[PDB]
A paper describes a structure:
The equilibrium position depends on mutations, on binding of substrates/substrate analogs/inhibitors either in the active site cavity or at the dimer interface, and on crystallization conditions. They inhibit hTS by targeting the enzyme active site. While FdUMP competes with the substrate, dUMP (2′-deoxyuridine-5′-monophosphate), RTX competes with the cofactor, N5, N10-methylenetatrahydrofolate (mTHF).
In particular, FdUMP occupies the same binding site as the natural substrate, dUMP, and is at contact distance with the catalytic Cys195. In the hTS:dUMP/FdUMP:RTX ternary complexes, the phosphate group of FdUMP is bound in the same way as the dUMP phosphate; RMSD upon superimposition of the two structures showed only minor changes at the interface of the two subunits where it engages salt links with four arginine residues belonging to both dimer halves (Arg50 and Arg250 from one subunit and Arg175′ and Arg176′ from the facing protomer), and a H-bond with the side chain of Ser216. A double H-bond bridge, reminiscent of the nucleic acid base pairs, links the FdUMP pyrimidine N3 and O4 atoms to Asn226 Nδ2 and Oδ1, respectively. RTX, besides giving the mentioned stacking interactions with FdUMP, is involved in few H-bonds with the enzyme: the quinazoline N3 and O4 atoms are H-bonded to the Asp218 side chain and to the NH of Gly222 respectively. The RTX terminal glutamic acid displays weak electron density and appears disordered and in different conformations. However, no covalent bond between the protein and the nucleotide is found in the X-ray crystal structure of the hTS:FdUMP:RTX ternary complex. The existence of the attractive stacking interactions between the pyrimidine and quinazoline rings and the absence of hindering interactions between the two bound inhibitors lead to a stabilization of the active complex.
Author numbering:
A (entry chain B), B (entry chain A): 26 to 313
The structure:
């Protein structure tokens, strides 16, 4: 059976061979394709890429950060994960005309939309308990009890909240699905930085699916990744060309180390990736 | 070059051959597959299906209805199109809890979220002039001023408005994309009745692409249809086996008969389908 990672790389080779040139907001420029889909089995494997070393600690920490509802970049930075610091910096904030905003404050982004969709956002430090829809919880409840439901969706695209956010969410909505005691997730990623964001994003929603499978007594099934604008930034082409030449290695496995009963009780120590020996890291310059 | 229609039929064959048996809200039963994508070209063809007659007037009147921002089945029925009536009727309203709602009042459905996302829904006869977000206008604006934008997005999934609607939307979101003067559109459909809904839906969003292309100066490109739960109801397996035997005739054409400027200007007579020569219609009864 072909390797899970070939979905990703074929998407790469596809964009390199057939992407069209197209300008982007950042000035960098891209080769791009509109609409793609990739299926990654979660069954006795976890799709953390092997053709380059993906920042696992960053994946797990980012997710726990969304779970607890945080729109504070500093809560994440302090766990040693820097990935949102630039989006929360004073300068970046000034550039979007948020001179009045405390730094680290990303606006009403992922964690907020996941746990409080509809609440009126004030700042990153306010308490929102009982405000808006706890979409993440409504998903776990439907799955436990009415698993055949075709509406198990969590959406972060809030048009009322877009003008306040430091970055409009790129993983806009996702849907869970249950058959034969398997929990599958599909992600609509409106915009996908193939070299940098994407491999991370696959680990992210793969993991979310493991967590949710765990607390609901289901076995993980498929992760289905759908992209809108799938782009390779021009400065990523050489590094990616390098990446392609590597033979993929067995995907690692994921061990959840104890019985956890609520999603919010999960802590970093509960997760152990075993058997991960990726090829060496590949730096891609992030466009700003 | 294979016929675009072979994408639709291919998905039916895939479901029938590989779908897992899955229960549904209506107790009808289905054959289900989670996560699919198809790409219909819109260049010098319009993907109205030929392997059975698609109710085109219905497509056209339903879209103008959504554009008008209407949420009243009667304003669509009066134009000879009855597809939303069961959902807007007294008994059905009461069944859902809306003792209080005037007959025809579907709640805050597609038209509302497209035109006035965020506004507190009153009833169907209300005026919502400048009251929530106008996702539709914004999409056209963004295509005109900044075509390269990776956030050209329309969303009907408002978790708050959900418990007020007759049927949570299947057209959960769509994204528009521009490159080399070509406009494309990707629809995310969380739930597809492959027999009844889907062929209608393909036409629907293909039309909207042709409209927005017309008032933005663009040639239409691809429509990408992505699927959440792609099902065939059990009492559709037979009509569809009949349907798979017919050989598709060349897709028809569509012409916009006059230069129109705003999206609201469009009227049913602005559109002519040329060359639509379908096989005889097959009735698929709607599961309830
Ligand atoms: C143009 C752009 N592309 C992105 O991929 C992107 C990603 C994020 C946030 N995000 C979802 C990220 C996931 C991983 C990331 C990253 O830069 N990590 C480096 C390693 C950094 C480290 O080791 O500390 C990497 O994966 O190479 S950034 C924010 C803005 C963006 N902007
Ligand atoms: C379970 C279910 N499946 C659906 O496909 C569906 C579709 C709609 C709305 N919709 C998107 C529809 C599109 C087309 C329709 C229909 O019934 N068409 C007939 C009318 C033709 C005629 O008599 O002239 C048909 O296709 O034959 S209904 C509403 C609830 C649903 N419910
Ligand atoms: O999780 C993410 N994944 C990702 O690929 N991006 C990239 C895609 C794009 O390159 C940029 C967002 O840019 P835009 O808003 O112009 O689509 O970030 C961002 C994330 F947060
Ligand atoms: O445009 C549509 N297309 C469609 O396929 N459905 C179908 C999908 C499903 O069979 C049912 C909705 O039920 P659920 O909400 O349980 O998915 O209606 C409804 C529409 F309005």
């Amino acid at each position: 059976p072909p390797h899970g990672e070939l979905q990703y790389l074929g998407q790469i080779q596809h964009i390199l061979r057939c992407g069209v040139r197209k300008d982007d907001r950042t000035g960098t420029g891209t080769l791009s394709v509109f609409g793609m889909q990739a299926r990654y089995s979660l069954r006795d494997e976890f799709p953390l890429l092997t053709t380059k070393r993906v920042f696992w600690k960053g994946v797990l920490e980012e997710l726990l950060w969304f779970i607890k509802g945080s729109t504070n970049a500093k809560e994440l930075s302090s766990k040693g994960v820097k990935i949102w610091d630039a989006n929360g910096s004073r300068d970046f904030l000034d550039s979007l005309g948020f001179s009045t905003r405390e730094e680290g404050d990303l606006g009403p982004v992922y964690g907020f939309q996941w746990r409080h969709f509809g609440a009126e956002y004030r700042d990153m430090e306010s308490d929102y308990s009982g405000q808006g829809v706890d979409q993440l919880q409504r998903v776990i409840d439907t799955i436990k009890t009415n698993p055949d439901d075709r509406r198990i969706i969590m959406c972060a695209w809030n048009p009322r909240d877009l003008p306040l956010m430091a970055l409009p969410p790129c993983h806009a909505l996702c849907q869970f699905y249950v058959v034969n005691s398997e929990l599958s997730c599909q992600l609509y990623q409106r915009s996908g930085d193939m070299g940098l964001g994407v491999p991370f994003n696959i680990a992210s929603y793969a993991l979310l699916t493991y967590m949710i499978a765990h607390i609901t007594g289901l076995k993980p099934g498929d992760f289905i990744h759908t992209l809108g604008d799938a782009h390779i930034y021009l400065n990523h082409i050489e590094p990616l060309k390098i990446q392609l030449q590597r033979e993929p290695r067995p995907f690692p496995k994921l061990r959840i180390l104890r019985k956890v009963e609520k999603i919010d009780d999960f802590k970093a120590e509960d997760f152990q990736i075993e058997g991960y020996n990726p090829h060496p890291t590949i730096k891609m310059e992030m466009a700003v």
